[PDB]
């Protein structure tokens with residue numbers, strides 16, 4: 200457990216790790232894969248541009264520093280990471296490998312700046328978070344395994360159907376190779392697919408949102424084909440589209456993820472969408488509007504009219520449910536869109552503009568859309584005094600730009 204002095208070090212130095220985040224990450228993978236090349240089968244080996252990797256890390260580090268004295272906020276951010284790690288199959292015996300190489304990378308990159316006090320303080324933070332995470336992941340694994348139709352680790356599924364939904368999105372329906380039941384999931388949760396990538400000579404693992412509602416027998420995912428032409432094609436989405444056919448097998452993780460409505464709560468729901476389409480948002484809006492009624496606000500951050508399937512489904516729901524309050528932002532309104540009949544406000548969702556409308560007692564907030572959108576909205580809500588534990592967000596479905 201960290202003393203106040205050691206928390207103080209972490210706090211004063213988090214911006215330092217952040218500022219050097221790109222170099223630290225590069226050195227970390229280099230050192231780790233050199234000792235433990237088998238971990239390339241669990242980590243994502245596709246290249247992501249520099250800024251993106253720097254930011255992700257900066258963000259994790261700042262999230263930790265900000266909540267290092269607030270147990271309830273800290274646990275809220277940890278459970279999100281526990282869910283992802285449990286989806287990936289992270290094991291307790293891997294924590295000492297990651298901590299050794301992460302510390303050594305911190306020292307190497309920071310060079311002189313990496314004082315004895317700083318390395319030791321961050322080694323402590325590592326040991327404390329690893330303890331928390333291991334216990335949380337073990338709970339997840341055990342709870343999944345005890346559910347009817349649940350399991351630990353990889354379970355083999357068969358593609359029962361494969362249907363294009365657009366020229367680039369294809370829906371896959373999966374049933375377990377053993378023919379047994381499959382455990383329920385809530386809208387917003389994901390599976391992971393683990394598959395051998397022949398071009399890499401490695402397994403890769405990717406998360407896919409689980410569509411529709413559970414039925415005890417099968418799962419459905421919608422997979423967007425990534426890249427091609429100017430864009431170098433993505434490994435797993437292209438592999439699913441072009442080589443994974445009806446009758447072929449894939450390995451799935453049990454459903455995980457903390458982004459979902461608590462069907463047992465009675466408190467208000469603020470859904471904030473940054474461009475996600477009718478599928479899969481509809482399943483989640485359905486859960487929000489199940490009886491007994493809860494106050495539901497939907498904040499729809501769209502382009503404009505050009506696609507309006509989600510705007511229309513929402514307007515219809517707002518006519519049946521007096522407990523649904525709808526707000527629309529169009530960031531680039533079409534010449535033909537007028538403020539007041541086609542949308543409410545110009546630009547990206549701006550929560551200060553609707554404060555009184557969304558700042559509801561004991562609400563939970565559910566943000567989805569592009570990753571920078573979710574982050575912007577997360578931080579806006581934190582600035583209004585909302586606790587970390589009441590803000591939820593995740594990649595949700597195959598098209599964060601559908602509307």
Ligand SMILES: Cc1cc2nc3c(=O)[nH]c(=O)nc-3n(C[C@H](O)[C@H](O)[C@H](O)COP(=O)(O)OP(=O)(O)OC[C@H]3O[C@@H](n4cnc5c(N)ncnc54)[C@H](O)[C@@H]3O)c2cc1C
Nearest residue numbers: 245406407408422423425426431433434435436594596597
């Ligand atoms: C919780 C969660 C839920 C998700 N749900 C869905 C879902 O329901 N449906 C869905 O389709 N996806 C979903 N995703 C995205 C999915 O997990 C994969 O990330 C996606 O399928 C792309 O993986 P890939 O292996 O095909 O691409 P990767 O090979 O990992 O590449 C990723 C991107 O990088 C591009 N790229 C190639 N070379 C470079 C380079 N030079 N520099 C920068 N970029 C490059 C690729 O074209 C691709 O666009 C979800 C992700 C998460 C985290």
Ligand code: HEM
Nearest residue numbers: 241242243259280283287289290293294297325328329332
């Ligand atoms: C205290 C120690 C650890 C911390 C704080 C930590 C933190 C994080 C964070 C913040 C994410 C991003 C989560 C998200 O995108 O939602 C992540 C993802 C991930 N973690 Fe960890 N983690 C730790 C240990 C481990 C261990 C021991 C493993 C074992 C291999 C591991 C493997 C992964 C993988 C494979 C991902 C997905 C990203 C990718 O594939 O490149 N982590 N973790």
Ligand SMILES: Clc1ccc(CO[C@@H](Cn2ccnc2)c2ccc(Cl)cc2Cl)c(Cl)c1
Nearest residue numbers: 216224227255256259260301321324325328
């Ligand atoms: Cl106490 C503490 C624990 C872990 C870390 C960084 O941990 C690495 C390593 N990692 C990668 C996935 N899971 C862990 C990390 C994590 C998230 C991201 Cl986005 C990139 C990286 Cl390089 C730090 Cl700075 C301090």
